[PDB]
Design a binder for this molecule. Structure first.
Ligand SMILES: COC(=O)C[C@@H]1N=C(c2ccc3cc[nH]c3c2)c2cc(OC)ccc2-n2c(C)nnc21
Length: 109
């Protein structure tokens, strides 16, 4: 229970204006059609984004911190999986993930 409150604070920081310069591609689900990505859902079997994490947190769908962490890492992993390593969105994902991983590691154990 206390770990999920810490994860909620993590989610608020990831969504905060402080990180908007690199977090914004992850605010909403990838719209493959709008982005012209005809193969996105062939490659990415389980899409994830911060608005989906926020909904599941608000509706108390996560049973523990590890389930929350798996969704956030899935969001980043999808980005790395679909895109080349020098892509700008990959650089943004790495910057947001450093925020997530550091706050997550400070979780009371
Ligand atoms: C054509 O889209 C692609 O190639 C893959 C795609 N990319 C970018 C993106 C973001 C910032 C920059 C800066 C220069 N290029 C960029 C591309 C992108 C842009 C979005 O807008 C609302 C939403 C999702 C992504 N998104 C995620 C998440 N995971 N993959 C992608």
């Amino acid at each position: 229970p206390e770990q999920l409150k810490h994860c909620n604070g993590i989610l608020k920081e990831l969504l905060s204006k402080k990180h908007a310069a690199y977090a914004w591609p992850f605010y909403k689900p990838v719209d493959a059609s709008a982005l012209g990505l005809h193969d996105y859902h062939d490659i990415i079997k389980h899409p994830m984004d911060l608005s989906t994490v926020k909904r599941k947190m608000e509706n108390r769908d996560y049973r523990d911190a590890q389930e929350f962490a798996a969704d956030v890492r899935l969001m980043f992993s999808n980005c790395y999986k679909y895109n080349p390593p020098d892509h700008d969105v990959v650089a943004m994902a790495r910057k947001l993930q450093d925020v997530f991983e550091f706050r997550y590691a400070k979780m009371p154990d």
